[PDB]
Design a protein that fits this description.
Elements: E1 14-17, E2 20-26, E3 29-38, E4 42-53, E5 56-60, H1 66-79, E6 84-88, H2 94-97, H3 100-105, E7 109-113, H4 114-119, E8 130-132, E9 151-154, E10 166-169, E11 174-178, H5 200-210, E12 216-219, H6 228-238
Parallel strand pairs: 5-6, 6-7, 7-8, 11-12
Antiparallel strand pairs: 1-2, 2-3, 3-4, 4-5, 9-10, 10-11
Helix pairs in contact: 5-6
The protein binds the ligand COc1cccc(OC)c1C(=O)N[C@H](C(=O)O)[C@@H]1N[C@@H](C(=O)O)C(C)(C)S1 and zinc ion (2 copies).
């Protein structure tokens, strides 16, 4: 089994498939986990989501690479056997957008914050094919997110990056914080190289308030946690100001 240097370990309830791990979170929701080997350091796990919505599947975040992302699509075909309608990617970093070309080669419609698409070329990424825009309170403009089914996209403000977005899964008690949110026992906020240290705490709290009844908080580099992940992340971020 895969034992990453950074990221949750494999536990009961995880399925290894190729180089990835998949974990069912709800009857219609799975977490995908992929690993980037860094020289001298070992593997860094990154998580995203797969959601079944009737006769189609929706994806949140790519894997770190195109080949890993193709493996996610192969898991979906094996385990669910339904077409992927769209993917939402949650900011212009490799862990979230590194596999765009695999989605595009598969014919999957891709969506990201307009700002992520504008930043992608600067970050060594390929832009999504569609841009999401947001209201002044963070909620996505619905005409930009057509036919998103249960995915409720919210821009919480600058934090981990200026472009980070989050996704609630309507009809469940799950919300996805991506790299913005760290787990309740984390010692650090991760890579702050692109972060907005002034606004981070408010942005973490705004994610909590956008999805006030989400009890299972999914994030990029830890196992799903309680809402203490949100509150702890904000408390860490209070120290940055
Ligand atoms: C353009 O992106 C990259 C290029 C090369 C290597 C990378 O990660 C090792 C990445 C890249 O995607 N870096 C991200 C980032 O900088 O936020 C990752 N997310 C961080 C986080 O959630 O705190 C991390 C797990 C410490 S690294
Ligand atoms: Zn990032
Ligand atoms: Zn990350």
């Amino acid at each position: 089994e895969i034992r990453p240097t950074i990221g949750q370990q494999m536990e009961t309830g995880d399925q290894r498939f190729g180089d990835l791990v998949f974990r069912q979170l709800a009857p219609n929701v799975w977490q995908h986990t992929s690993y980037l080997d860094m020289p001298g350091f070992g593997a860094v796990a990154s998580n995203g989501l797969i959601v079944r919505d009737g006769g189609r599947v929706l994806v949140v975040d790519t894997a770190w690479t195109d080949d890993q992302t193709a493996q996610i699509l192969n898991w979906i075909k094996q385990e669910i056997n339904l077409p992927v309608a769209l993917a939402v990617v949650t900011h212009a970093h490799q862990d979230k957008m590194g596999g765009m070309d695999a989605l595009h080669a598969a014919g999957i419609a891709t969506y990201a914050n307009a700002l992520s698409n504008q930043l992608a070329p600067q970050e060594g990424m390929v832009a999504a094919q569609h841009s999401l825009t947001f209201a002044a309170n963070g909620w996505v403009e619905p005409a930009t997110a057509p036919n998103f089914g249960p995915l409720k996209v919210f821009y919480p403000g600058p934090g981990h990056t200026s472009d980070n977005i989050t996704v609630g899964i309507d009809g469940t008690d799950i919300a996805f914080g991506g790299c913005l949110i760290k787990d309740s026992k984390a010692k650090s906020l991760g890579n702050l190289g692109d972060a907005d240290t002034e606004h981070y705490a408010a942005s973490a709290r705004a994610f909590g308030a956008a999805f006030p009844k989400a009890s299972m908080i999914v994030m990029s580099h830890s196992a799903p946690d309680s809402r203490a992940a949100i509150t702890h992340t904000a408390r860490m971020a209070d120290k940055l100001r």
